[PDB]
């Protein structure tokens, strides 16, 4: 499998399963699964009452130094009943690594803001509130940051339409860009792609 | 009703309305909002224009992808005429002048053209026509427009006899010659009596007897809810727009009040309300500024 | 059935906050009309208010309503300070969409739709 | 082409048009495809 | 593995501090900069005079589209439909029959070149050369619709370029 | 191979023209409908069927790589020509 | 294969009889207020209702209910079955009351008056598959069909 | 006569001096504005055409539209497009700003600035090279070159 088979890193994930033990024994009040993946990326899946000790903890620690947080987002997964999946991407510059955080929030449960804990989550938790409507409770300026300023709902919902509710075009009745209900000249094509045969043994669902 | 021209979506942009509709006289103030309200139905606009085709730009945003035909035209060509119309299902003629040049008179503006559109579109078996005349058109009126606009009406009438002959009173709005007239003369108060209609009021009149089959071969008069005094109706435009060009025959027009023919339909006949003048004034009169409202009668 | 709340413990303090942000906008309502120049009245723009907050009036989940508090919030910040345009602040006022049919047989003669 | 000329094809066009965009020779979009419902065509005749 | 710009401590005798004095009262290095704008000013400009002049292209150039046929007559697009799979934009549409003597062929191939992004993956997806995205950079319109092409149009467009759009896959298909 | 409606209005290789009461014509009106007068089903009816002497002949359309996919054309129906499914180029066996 | 009858001959708009007697095209309000002004000119058994092959139960119970307001029972199917005796009181007595999976239970199957073939073909099917792996036995009253 | 003579000799005059000093406003919005300042870059040099790199924006002839226009920006565009003195023309550059492009089924893009603006020429291209955009701005040359504002002054 030498030429085309991306090799596997054995040290890495040897010593991000044993950080990921750390993790969990130091902060089992708040962490829930500890999962290295095949390519070596460590995630801490955590209790969404310990956003602000696991983010500082790992920001703090002398054995962590998360100092840099890379990315923080939202992920809609709308068969959960906590169906928003916060990711947080740290990144330590002393020890060359990076770990994902992850937590659950639905509609209407709040999560706490971490502006407190890197200052780089301003604007990401306020495009998560954007696009998810993921309320980050004790967020400095919390508002929307991409879509247009009278608009409703949050469009990276899955149920949320691709084109929208409504369109807009220059109307010269009123000298006034107006917004009517949308409606395409061609419907976006949709293509059933998935084969229906399996992919992936390996990734195999047990049945009921 | 052939299967291109059923009506289809739910009566936006990208919908039919299976309306096809050719409006003469469409670069003008009137034929603006008309080819507007026409467009955001999705309606198939033909445009033939006089004029230079970058005075035609501001109708290109009102509809759809090929929903607004532009092609050339001249008034006493029955050939440009006739290549309009022979694909339209309904004819709007908003060709006017409020002044007279040295190529088109107010005979060739209100009666030859009009008559010419009429008749063409009745040989190419166009099922409805719509003509612009005006409220106050006499045959013995003071005013060479209002003598030939009745004439003109006249002989519409009588050459395409399923014609909606509409009556609008002194059509205000943004880009109108009422008060945009009254907001820059800065002519005097007699005993005028006038009820001047909004033009979105027309615009809707003129679509709903578009849709409307029972509006064939009907007069209808398009007045505002409110008659004025001339004199206070200037001291109102005068009092919105913060204020303490023009002919004789304008003149004579001004001074000719709006006569009242109940007999004839209006725009609560096609289910339009008249929308009056103090609501409208200011989005008129905000353009001229660097008020107790108007007496009715 | 135990849920961790927004504001709100219970539907009082969230109705005083709906209390509170209805205040808000009808004082901010005529500066509105005002700076904007909108060609609305300040009784137009105040019916709309109280028709977008009687719009909402069947909630009684205090989690929404503290949302709906939330977000009438950033309405009103995005219309106090001038984020919004004039377009905006019309397009709670469905002006160039047509009328839509609203019984059973307009509906049926325009098209499929319920 | 002089040195190296074009593969000649029957079907490539003698005489090459420039930008016709703005003239009567300009490209107008349709649709290629036919009338894809067949309506009823009533009878002509009557039904007494 | 790492340099320090900008760590300089500039030397304090009275030889260099006279030299950055002189810098600072006799506007040195601002000579320098109007020495270089000069030296641009006895170049030989770096303009081309189009359009009498063209900007140099590859075969590879990714321009207007055109639909392709067989040294026959005989139009390539056996009506697949990888094209408008692959499309990114979905600017492709096609409808299909077939046609009078029973073959595999079009009848609808719409392209709206302005929803197209220009990727050349309906080339690249074509199994028998049919789409092809040829040389034609200089196409622009007046209306939108006259950029929303159907079959005819590209077949024309195939018929005008093909003297051009054939030498350029003969230098290029190797690669592909 | 271009033919004409009775309205003037050309017919496309698809066969599409529109009506005489349909007014979507208005959109060719001081403009052009554009077809195109190489008709495909025309031009390769023109190219003479190959004569060969085996039972199963291949067909890559011409120029290797530069053709279509290499497909193989079974000739054992003497009544029927065999056509390729790709470029319609038709072959017999001449016995 | 029969879905391309259902792209021809369609009706797609109201027709009416015109002055002269034939069907011209016109507008729902136009047909409807001709349709409906001669309903309310009858009452008891002067308006019936066919009822055609293809119809939903919806469209079913709109035209009985329209019907009976004006008080007419005379609502009527094409394909006839007797009314003697229980009728259609009982659903027992017209349905397939065993099922179409029944027949995979059966031993013994007696076909009365029908050719299940071109009359339900996949009925008739389920019957072959008794047939082949049951060993059923089927028996037909009626022309000796295939 | 003598009067059109003098009228198309008028219209030849001041459309020579519109479209011989096009001074363009540029709504850089996306990927358009690096091919745009390659057109004005030393090779292919707006500026020898009289189209000066940089207008100013209250006295520009023509807007070119180089970018996606959001829903977010298309009252600033239709109001940078009311602030300009006449005549204006609008040159569309790129899929996005003629047809909403690679995001025409966006919940947040104008399907082409063209429901919001009228446009003058459509510039076809993700982006169109800066040799397209030139091509587009001389077709926008001669279509100021063949205007008639006199003759159809005169003829009215
Ligand atoms: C009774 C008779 C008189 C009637 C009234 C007319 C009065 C005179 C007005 C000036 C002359 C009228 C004609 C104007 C030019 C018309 C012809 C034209 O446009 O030719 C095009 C030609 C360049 O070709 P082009 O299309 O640009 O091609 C691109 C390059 N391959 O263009 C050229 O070669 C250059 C064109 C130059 C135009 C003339 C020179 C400028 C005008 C000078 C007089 C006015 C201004 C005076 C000073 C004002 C303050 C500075
Ligand atoms: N308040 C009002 O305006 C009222 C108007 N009316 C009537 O309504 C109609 C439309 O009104 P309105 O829009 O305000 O008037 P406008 O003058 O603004 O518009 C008139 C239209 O007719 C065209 N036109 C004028 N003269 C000629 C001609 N000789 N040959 C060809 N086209 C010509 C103009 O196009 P182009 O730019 O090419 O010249 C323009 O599109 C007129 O008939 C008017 O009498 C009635 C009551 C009140
Ligand atoms: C220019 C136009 C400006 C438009 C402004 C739009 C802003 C919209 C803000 C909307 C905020 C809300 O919807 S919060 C309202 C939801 N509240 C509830 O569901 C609780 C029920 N509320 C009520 O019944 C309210 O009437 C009261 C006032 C709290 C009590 O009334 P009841 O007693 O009888
Ligand atoms: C009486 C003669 C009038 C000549 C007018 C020429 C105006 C200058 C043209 C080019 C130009 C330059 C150099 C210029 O420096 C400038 O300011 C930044 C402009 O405005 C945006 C320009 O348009
Ligand atoms: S170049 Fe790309 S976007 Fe354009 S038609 Fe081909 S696949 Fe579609
Ligand atoms: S991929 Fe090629 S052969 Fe297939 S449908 Fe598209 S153009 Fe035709
Ligand atoms: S048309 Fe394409 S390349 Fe151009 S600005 Fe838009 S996304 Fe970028
Ligand atoms: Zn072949």
């Given at each position: 499998?030498?030429?085309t088979?991306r090799?596997?890193?054995?040290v890495?994930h040897?010593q991000?399963?044993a950080?990921?033990?750390?993790?969990?024994?130091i902060?089992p009040?708040?962490?829930?699964?500890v999962?290295?993946s095949?390519?070596?990326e460590l995630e801490?899946?955590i209790?969404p009452?310990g956003?602000?000790?696991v983010?500082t903890?790992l920001?703090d620690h002398?054995?962590?130094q998360?100092k840099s947080?890379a990315?923080?987002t939202?992920?809609?997964?709308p068969?959960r009943?906590?169906?928003?999946?916060?990711?947080?991407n740290?990144?330590s510059?002393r020890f060359?690594?990076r770990?994902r955080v992850?937590?659950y929030?639905?509609?209407?449960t709040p999560?706490?803001?971490?502006?407190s804990?890197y200052?780089?989550?301003?604007?990401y938790?306020?495009?998560?509130?954007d696009?998810?409507?993921?309320?980050?409770a004790?967020?400095?300026?919390?508002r929307?940051?991409?879509?247009?300023?009278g608009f409703e709902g949050?469009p990276?919902r899955?149920?949320?339409?691709l084109?929208?509710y409504?369109?807009?075009?220059?109307?010269?009745?009123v000298?006034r860009?107006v917004?009517?209900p949308?409606?395409?000249?061609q419907?976006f094509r949709?293509?059933?792609?998935?084969?229906?045969?399996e992919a992936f043994?390996?990734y195999?669902?047990?049945?009921? | 009703?052939?299967?291109?021209?059923?009506?289809?979506?739910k009566?936006g942009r990208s919908?039919?309305s299976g309306?096809?509709?050719t409006?003469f006289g469409?670069t003008?103030?009137?034929?603006?909002?008309?080819?507007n309200?026409?467009?955001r139905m999705?309606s198939?606009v033909?445009?033939?224009?006089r004029?230079?085709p970058?005075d035609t730009?501001?109708?290109?945003?009102?509809?759809?992808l090929?929903?607004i035909?532009?092609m050339d035209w001249?008034?006493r060509d029955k050939?440009?005429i006739?290549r309009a119309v022979?694909?339209?299902?309904?004819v709007?003629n908003?060709?006017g002048?409020?002044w007279?040049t040295?190529?088109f008179?107010?005979?060739?503006?209100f009666?030859k053209?009009?008559?010419?559109?009429?008749?063409?579109?009745?040989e190419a078996?166009?099922?409805?026509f719509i003509?612009?005349?005006?409220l106050?058109a006499?045959?013995?009126?003071s005013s060479?427009?209002?003598?030939?606009?009745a004439?003109?009406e006249?002989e519409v009438?009588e050459?395409?006899?399923?014609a909606?002959?509409?009556?609008?009173?002194?059509?205000?709005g943004?880009?109108?010659?009422?008060?945009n007239?009254?907001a820059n003369?800065?002519s005097?108060?007699?005993?005028t009596?006038?009820?001047?209609?909004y033009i979105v009021?027309?615009?809707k009149?003129?679509?709903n007897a578009?849709?409307?089959?029972?509006?064939?071969?009907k007069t209808?008069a398009f007045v505002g809810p409110?008659?004025?005094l001339?004199?206070?109706?200037?001291?109102?435009?005068?009092?919105?727009?913060?204020?303490?060009?023009?002919?004789?025959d304008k003149?004579e027009?001004?001074?000719?009040?709006?006569?009242?023919?109940?007999?004839?339909?209006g725009?609560?006949?096609?289910?339009?309300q008249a929308?009056?003048?103090?609501?409208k004034?200011?989005?008129?009169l905000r353009?001229?500024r660097?008020?107790?409202?108007?007496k009715?009668? | 059935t135990s849920?961790?709340?927004?504001?709100?413990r219970?539907?009082?303090?969230?109705?005083?906050r709906?209390?509170?942000?209805?205040?808000?906008?009808?004082?901010?309502?005529?500066?509105?009309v005002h700076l904007?120049?909108?060609?609305?009245?300040?009784?137009?723009?105040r019916?709309?208010?109280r028709?977008?907050?009687?719009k909402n009036a069947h909630?009684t989940?205090?989690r929404?309503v503290?949302l709906?508090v939330?977000?009438?919030?950033?309405?009103?910040?995005?219309?106090?300070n001038?984020?919004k345009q004039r377009?905006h602040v019309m397009?709670?006022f469905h002006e160039?969409e047509?009328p839509?049919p609203k019984?059973?047989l307009?509906?049926?003669?325009?098209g499929?739709?319920? | 082409?002089?040195?190296?000329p074009?593969t000649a094809?029957?079907?490539?066009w003698?005489?090459?048009k420039?930008?016709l965009?703005?003239?009567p020779?300009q490209?107008?979009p349709?649709?290629?495809?036919?009338?894809?419902?067949?309506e009823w065509?009533?009878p002509?005749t009557?039904y007494? | 593995?790492y340099?320090?710009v900008?760590l300089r401590?500039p030397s304090?005798?009275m030889?260099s501090?006279?030299?950055?004095?002189a810098?600072?009262?006799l506007?040195?290095?601002?000579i320098r900069?109007?020495?270089?704008?000069?030296?641009?000013?006895?170049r030989?400009?770096?303009t081309?005079?189009?359009?009498?002049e063209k900007?140099?292209?590859?075969?590879?150039?990714r321009?207007?589209?055109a639909l392709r046929?067989?040294?026959?007559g005989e139009?390539?697009c056996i009506?697949?439909?990888l094209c408008?799979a692959?499309?990114?934009?979905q600017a492709?549409?096609?409808?299909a029959?077939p046609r009078?003597?029973g073959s595999?062929?079009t009848t609808?191939?719409?392209?709206?070149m302005?929803?197209?992004?220009?990727?050349?993956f309906c080339?690249?997806?074509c199994?028998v050369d049919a789409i092809?995205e040829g040389?034609?950079?200089?196409?622009?319109?007046?209306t939108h619709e006259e950029l929303?092409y159907?079959?005819e149009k590209?077949?024309?467009?195939?018929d005008?370029?093909?003297?051009?759009?054939?030498a350029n896959?003969?230098?290029?298909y190797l690669?592909? | 191979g271009?033919?004409?409606?009775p309205?003037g209005?050309?017919?496309?290789?698809?066969?599409?023209?529109?009506?005489?009461?349909?007014?979507?014509?208005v959109?060719?009106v001081?403009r052009?409908?554009?077809?195109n007068?190489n008709?495909?089903?025309?031009?390769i009816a023109?190219?003479?069927?190959?004569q060969?002497?085996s039972?199963?002949i291949?067909?890559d359309?011409g120029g290797?790589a530069?053709?279509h996919?290499?497909?193989y054309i079974?000739?054992?129906k003497?009544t029927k020509?065999?056509?390729?499914?790709?470029?319609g180029?038709?072959?017999?066996?001449?016995? | 294969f029969a879905?391309?009858?259902?792209?021809?001959?369609?009706?797609?708009?109201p027709?009416?009889?015109?002055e002269?007697?034939?069907?011209?095209?016109?507008t729902?309000?136009?047909?409807?207020?001709?349709?409906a002004?001669?309903?309310?000119?009858c009452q008891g058994?002067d308006?019936?209702?066919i009822?055609g092959?293809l119809?939903?139960?919806?469209?079913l119970?709109?035209?009985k209910?329209?019907?009976?307001?004006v008080?007419s029972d005379?609502?009527?199917?094409?394909?006839?079955?007797p009314?003697?005796?229980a009728g259609?009181?009982?659903?027992?007595?017209?349905?397939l009351n065993?099922?179409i999976?029944?027949?995979?239970?059966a031993d013994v199957?007696?076909?009365?008056?029908?050719?299940?073939?071109?009359?339900?073909?996949l009925?008739?099917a389920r019957?072959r598959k008794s047939?082949?792996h049951?060993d059923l036995?089927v028996?037909?009253?009626?022309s000796?069909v295939? | 006569?003598?009067?059109?003579?003098?009228v198309?000799?008028?219209?030849?005059?001041?459309?020579?001096a519109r479209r011989?000093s096009?001074?363009?406003?540029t709504f850089?919005?996306?990927?358009?504005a690096?091919?745009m300042?390659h057109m004005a870059?030393?090779?292919?040099?707006?500026d020898?055409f009289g189209?000066?790199?940089?207008?100013?924006?209250?006295?520009?002839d023509?807007?070119?539209?180089?970018?996606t226009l959001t829903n977010?920006?298309?009252?600033?565009?239709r109001?940078?497009?009311?602030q300009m003195?006449?005549?204006?023309?609008?040159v569309?550059?790129?899929?996005?700003?003629?047809?909403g492009?690679?995001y025409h089924?966006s919940?947040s893009?104008?399907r082409g600035?063209?429901?919001?603006v009228?446009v003058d020429?459509?510039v076809?291209?993700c982006p169109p090279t800066?040799?397209?955009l030139?091509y587009?701005?001389?077709?926008?040359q001669?279509?100021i070159?063949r205007?008639?504002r006199?003759?159809?002054?005169?003829?009215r």
């Amino acid at each position: 499998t030498r030429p085309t088979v991306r090799p596997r890193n054995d040290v890495a994930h040897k010593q991000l399963s044993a950080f990921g033990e750390y993790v969990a024994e130091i902060l089992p009040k708040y962490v829930q699964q500890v999962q290295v993946s095949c390519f070596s990326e460590l995630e801490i899946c955590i209790h969404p009452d310990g956003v602000i000790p696991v983010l500082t903890f790992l920001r703090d620690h002398s054995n962590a130094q998360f100092k840099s947080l890379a990315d923080l987002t939202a992920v809609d997964i709308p068969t959960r009943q906590n169906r928003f999946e916060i990711v947080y991407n740290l990144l330590s510059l002393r020890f060359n690594s990076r770990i994902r955080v992850k937590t659950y929030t639905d509609e209407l449960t709040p999560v706490e803001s971490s502006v407190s804990v890197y200052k780089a989550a301003n604007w990401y938790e306020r495009e998560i509130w954007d696009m998810f409507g993921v309320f980050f409770a004790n967020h400095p300026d919390l508002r929307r940051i991409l879509t247009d300023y009278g608009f409703e709902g949050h469009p990276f919902r899955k149920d949320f339409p691709l084109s929208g509710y409504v369109e807009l075009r220059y109307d010269d009745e009123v000298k006034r860009v107006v917004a009517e209900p949308v409606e395409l000249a061609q419907e976006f094509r949709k293509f059933d792609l998935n084969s229906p045969w399996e992919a992936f043994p390996a990734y195999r669902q047990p049945p009921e | 009703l052939h299967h291109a021209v059923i009506p289809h979506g739910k009566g936006g942009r990208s919908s039919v309305s299976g309306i096809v509709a050719t409006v003469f006289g469409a670069t003008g103030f009137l034929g603006r909002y008309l080819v507007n309200h026409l467009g955001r139905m999705g309606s198939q606009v033909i445009v033939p224009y006089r004029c230079e085709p970058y005075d035609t730009m501001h109708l290109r945003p009102m509809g759809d992808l090929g929903q607004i035909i532009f092609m050339d035209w001249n008034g006493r060509d029955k050939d440009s005429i006739r290549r309009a119309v022979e694909h339209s299902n309904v004819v709007i003629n908003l060709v006017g002048r409020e002044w007279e040049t040295k190529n088109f008179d107010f005979e060739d503006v209100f009666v030859k053209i009009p008559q010419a559109i009429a008749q063409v579109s009745k040989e190419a078996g166009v099922e409805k026509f719509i003509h612009i005349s005006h409220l106050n058109a006499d045959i013995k009126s003071s005013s060479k427009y209002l003598r030939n606009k009745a004439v003109g009406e006249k002989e519409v009438r009588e050459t395409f006899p399923e014609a909606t002959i509409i009556k609008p009173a002194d059509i205000f709005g943004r880009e109108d010659r009422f008060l945009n007239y009254f907001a820059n003369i800065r002519s005097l108060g007699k005993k005028t009596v006038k009820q001047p209609v909004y033009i979105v009021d027309v615009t809707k009149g003129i679509i709903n007897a578009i849709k409307d089959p029972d509006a064939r071969g009907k007069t209808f008069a398009f007045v505002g809810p409110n008659r004025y005094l001339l004199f206070d109706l200037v001291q109102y435009v005068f009092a919105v727009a913060h204020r303490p060009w023009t002919t004789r025959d304008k003149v004579e027009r001004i001074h000719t009040t709006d006569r009242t023919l109940p007999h004839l339909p209006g725009l609560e006949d096609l289910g339009v309300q008249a929308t009056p003048l103090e609501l409208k004034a200011i989005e008129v009169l905000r353009r001229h500024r660097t008020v107790q409202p108007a007496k009715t009668v | 059935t135990s849920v961790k709340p927004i504001f709100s413990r219970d539907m009082n303090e969230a109705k005083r906050r709906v209390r509170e942000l209805y205040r808000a906008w009808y004082r901010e309502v005529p500066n509105t009309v005002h700076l904007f120049q909108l060609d609305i009245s300040v009784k137009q723009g105040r019916d709309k208010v109280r028709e977008m907050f009687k719009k909402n009036a069947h909630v009684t989940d205090p989690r929404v309503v503290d949302l709906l508090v939330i977000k009438g919030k950033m309405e009103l910040e995005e219309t106090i300070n001038v984020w919004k345009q004039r377009t905006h602040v019309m397009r709670f006022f469905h002006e160039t969409e047509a009328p839509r049919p609203k019984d059973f047989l307009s509906k049926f003669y325009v098209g499929h739709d319920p | 082409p002089t040195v190296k000329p074009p593969t000649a094809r029957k079907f490539i066009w003698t005489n090459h048009k420039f930008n016709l965009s703005g003239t009567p020779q300009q490209y107008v979009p349709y649709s290629t495809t036919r009338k894809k419902i067949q309506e009823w065509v009533p009878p002509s005749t009557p039904y007494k | 593995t790492y340099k320090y710009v900008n760590l300089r401590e500039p030397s304090m005798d009275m030889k260099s501090v006279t030299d950055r004095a002189a810098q600072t009262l006799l506007w040195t290095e601002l000579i320098r900069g109007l020495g270089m704008t000069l030296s641009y000013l006895f170049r030989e400009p770096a303009t081309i005079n189009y359009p009498f002049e063209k900007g140099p292209l590859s075969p590879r150039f990714r321009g207007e589209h055109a639909l392709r046929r067989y040294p026959s007559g005989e139009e390539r697009c056996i009506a697949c439909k990888l094209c408008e799979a692959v499309c990114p934009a979905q600017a492709i549409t096609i409808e299909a029959e077939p046609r009078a003597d029973g073959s595999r062929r079009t009848t609808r191939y719409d392209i709206d070149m302005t929803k197209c992004i220009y990727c050349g993956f309906c080339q690249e997806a074509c199994p028998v050369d049919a789409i092809v995205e040829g040389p034609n950079f200089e196409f622009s319109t007046e209306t939108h619709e006259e950029l929303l092409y159907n079959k005819e149009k590209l077949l024309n467009n195939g018929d005008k370029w093909e003297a051009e759009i054939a030498a350029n896959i003969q230098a290029d298909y190797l690669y592909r | 191979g271009v033919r004409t409606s009775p309205t003037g209005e050309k017919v496309t290789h698809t066969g599409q023209v529109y009506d005489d009461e349909d007014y979507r014509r208005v959109r060719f009106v001081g403009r052009q409908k554009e077809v195109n007068e190489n008709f495909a089903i025309d031009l390769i009816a023109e190219q003479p069927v190959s004569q060969v002497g085996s039972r199963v002949i291949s067909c890559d359309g011409g120029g290797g790589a530069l053709g279509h996919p290499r497909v193989y054309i079974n000739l054992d129906k003497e009544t029927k020509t065999g056509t390729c499914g790709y470029c319609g180029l038709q072959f017999r066996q001449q016995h | 294969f029969a879905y391309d009858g259902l792209k021809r001959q369609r009706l797609t708009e109201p027709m009416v009889r015109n002055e002269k007697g034939l069907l011209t095209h016109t507008t729902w309000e136009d047909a409807l207020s001709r349709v409906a002004g001669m309903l309310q000119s009858c009452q008891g058994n002067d308006v019936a209702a066919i009822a055609g092959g293809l119809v939903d139960a919806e469209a079913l119970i709109a035209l009985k209910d329209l019907l009976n307001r004006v008080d007419s029972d005379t609502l009527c199917t094409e394909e006839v079955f007797p009314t003697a005796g229980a009728g259609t009181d009982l659903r027992s007595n017209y349905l397939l009351n065993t099922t179409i999976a029944g027949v995979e239970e059966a031993d013994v199957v007696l076909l009365v008056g029908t050719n299940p073939r071109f009359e339900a073909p996949l009925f008739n099917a389920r019957i072959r598959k008794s047939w082949l792996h049951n060993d059923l036995k089927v028996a037909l009253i009626g022309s000796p069909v295939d | 006569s003598r009067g059109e003579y003098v009228v198309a000799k008028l219209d030849d005059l001041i459309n020579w001096a519109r479209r011989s000093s096009l001074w363009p406003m540029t709504f850089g919005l996306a990927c358009c504005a690096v091919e745009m300042m390659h057109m004005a870059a030393p090779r292919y040099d707006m500026d020898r055409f009289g189209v000066v790199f940089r207008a100013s924006p209250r006295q520009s002839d023509v807007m070119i539209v180089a970018g996606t226009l959001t829903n977010k920006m298309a009252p600033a565009l239709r109001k940078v497009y009311d602030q300009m003195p006449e005549p204006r023309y609008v040159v569309s550059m790129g899929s996005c700003a003629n047809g909403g492009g690679y995001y025409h089924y966006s919940y947040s893009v104008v399907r082409g600035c063209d429901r919001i603006v009228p446009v003058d020429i459509y510039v076809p291209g993700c982006p169109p090279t800066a040799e397209a955009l030139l091509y587009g701005i001389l077709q926008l040359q001669k279509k100021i070159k063949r205007e008639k504002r006199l003759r159809i002054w005169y003829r009215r």
